[PDB]
Amino acid sequence: VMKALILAGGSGERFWPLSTPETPKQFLKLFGNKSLMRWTFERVLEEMDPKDVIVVTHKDYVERTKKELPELPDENIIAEPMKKNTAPACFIGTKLADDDEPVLVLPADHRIPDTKKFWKTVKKALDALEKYDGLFTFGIVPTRPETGYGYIEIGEELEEGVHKVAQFREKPDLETAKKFVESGRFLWNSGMFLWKAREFIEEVKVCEPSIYENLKDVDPRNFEELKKAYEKVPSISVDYAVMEKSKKVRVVKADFEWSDLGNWSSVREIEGYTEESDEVILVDSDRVFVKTHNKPIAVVGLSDVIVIDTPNGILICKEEYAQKVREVVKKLFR
Amino acid sequence: VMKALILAGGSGERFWPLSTPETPKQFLKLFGNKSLMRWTFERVLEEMDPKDVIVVTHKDYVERTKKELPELPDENIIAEPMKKNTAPACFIGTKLADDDEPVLVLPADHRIPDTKKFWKTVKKALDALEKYDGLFTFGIVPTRPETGYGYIEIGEELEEGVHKVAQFREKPDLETAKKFVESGRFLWNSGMFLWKAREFIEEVKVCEPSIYENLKDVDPRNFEELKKAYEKVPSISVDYAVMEKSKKVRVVKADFEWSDLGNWSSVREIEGYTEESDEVILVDSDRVFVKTHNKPIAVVGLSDVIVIDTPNGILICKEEYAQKVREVVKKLFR
C-alpha cells in the first residue's frame, strides 16, 4: 500500500529551440521518442498499479497529461489553479493517501535509466521508513559545486545504508557549495522524497502553517475550492518550506545513475560529443555537440560549443553558458 | 584606345554556405542586389564601351556570365579550358589588344564603391603609362599585417602619386608583413593592373617563358587550340610570375576605398557587426556577425564569431579562422 505522487516540473526554457516558449520540460522528448514524463510514468508502473499514482499539475497541462499517460485515471490528475511550486502540490497530493500510507514523491522531468536499481533503492527506503519514520531523501554523490541543488549533510548511521540528516541546505551559494563537496560529508538531494502521508502533513503544520491551515479541509479534486485556497497559499518549494526546517530527515544513497537534465550540457553528458559526418563538419573544432535539422552544420575554430538547429531557431552556445538559454527565451518572448 | 580585362577566376570556397560550385564568389550578390562582377562591370561601363571589355573565365561559368553581363558581346568572353591562376589569363586577354593599346586588368570579385575616384586613379595611371611605360599597380594604404596581400615598396617619385616600385613582395610571412606596415614605405597591391599590350607580353618572355612559348601564337577564341596550349602552362599568379621579377613596375596610390572581400570577415568589415533584434539574440556575446535565413539565431557566451544560415547549410566560424571555411567545402567534396 503506497502512493506515488508525480509532480509537474517547471519550464522547458533551457531547451530552446526544441522547447516552445512556456512548455513544461516534462513534455520534452529528449530520448527514445518519449517525453521525460512518459518515461517517469513507465518507471513507476514497473511496480505500481496506475490507480495508486497521482499527477499533481497545473490545469493547462491536464489534457496533455491525459494524452501522455492514457493508463492514468482522470480522477488521479489533480489540476492546480496556479503555479505555487512543490510544497502545496506535495501537500494536496499527499492528503489523498491514508494517514499511515507511504507516498513516493517524484519529479516528472528527471532521467533514471535503470528502473530496477531505482526500485531497489525505493524498497530500501520503504523498509527504513517503517523502522524510523521521518522524511526520506535520496542522495547522489556530488561531482561538482552545483548551486541549484539541495545538499544533505550525512548524519548518524541509523543502519547500514540509511542515515539521519545533520542538515539540509537548499541552493547554497558557490563558495558554500564548494566547501560542502570538499568535506565529503554531503550528498545532493535528488529531488525525490518518501514519507507517510500523516507524518508529512504534520511537518507542514509545524514547518509552514500558511499551507496547512488553508488546505487541510480542501478537496483537491474540487477546482473551485482549490482555487480559493491556493490564492491564500504561498508559493514555495518543499525543500525550503519543509526539508530545510524539519528535525526528522533521513537519507538513503541512490543505487542508480541519475540526472535532473538542467540544460543542453546535461544532454551532451549522456549522449556524448558529436562526431564529424556528412551533416556535421568540424574544422579546428573539438568537443562540439550538434543537433542537425535539415542541412549540414559546419563549425570552424571553436571548441566546447553546443549547436542546436530546429524549425523554431538555432542556438549556438558556449558549453559553460548552457544555463543562460533561459535569458535567450526572456528576450525572444517578451 | 583602351581595353578592360576582367579576370573571373571563380574562387568561392570561403563563402560557403552561400556560394556553390555553380555560383562562385563573383556571382554573389553580397551588396545591393547585384553580384560582385556586375558591380565591377557597371564601374567599368561608366567610361568604356562594352565592345572594349573582355572577361576571361572558366568555360563552366560562361553562360552564367552572359546572363550576368548581357551588354557584353558573346566574343568578349574568353573561355578558359581549365584554371591556371592570373598570369595566363592576363597573357591571353592582353593578347587581344593591339601592341600599344593600354590594358586595364581587373578582378571580378573585389569591391570599390566610389567609381568616380576609381576612374580618377585610372586616368592618372593612363597619363603616367603614356609618359613612363612599364607595368602599373594600384597601391592601397595598409591597416594590418595581412599575409595574403602582395606588398609594394615605394620607389622614386616620377610624379605626384606615381612611383617606380623598388620591390614587389607577394604574400610575405607574418613577421615580414608586420615590418612592412610598421615602416610606412609599403602599399598593398590591390590586384589590379594597367599596361600596354606588347610591353606586358614581352615582360612574360623574360619572367615566365613557360607561359609565353606555349601561348604566344595561340588564338584565345579557339577553345580547342587553347585547351592544348593550357596543358603545358604552369598555374601561377601574375604577381609571382611577373610582378616579383620585373624591373619596370610602377605604382599609383589609390584615391579610393577598396576590399578584396577575402572571406566572411571581410564582409563584416564593410557592413559592421550584427545588432540584437527579434531574429538575432545575443547573450554574453560581443562582436558577432550573423546572417539569418528563416528563423531566429541565438549566440550565447561567444564573441568574435561568424554565423551564416542559408538553405545550403549553417556556418559557425570563429572570426580569425574565416579563411579555413574553404576546408568545409573540401570536406563535403570528399
Ligand SMILES: O=P(O)(O)O[C@H]1O[C@H](CO)[C@@H](O)[C@H](O)[C@@H]1O
Ligand atoms: O525545484 P528544483 O529547483 O528543481 O530543485 C529540486 O530538485 C533538485 C534535484 O533536481 C534537488 O537538488 C533540490 O533539493 C529540489 O528538491
Ligand SMILES: O=P(O)(O)O[C@H]1O[C@H](CO)[C@@H](O)[C@H](O)[C@@H]1O
Ligand atoms: O591571388 P590573390 O590571393 O587574389 O592575391 C592577388 O590579389 C591581392 C589583392 O586582393 C594582391 O594583394 C596580391 O598581390 C595579388 O595580386
Ligand SMILES: [Mg+2]
Ligand atoms: Mg525540479
Ligand SMILES: [Mg+2]
Ligand atoms: Mg584575387
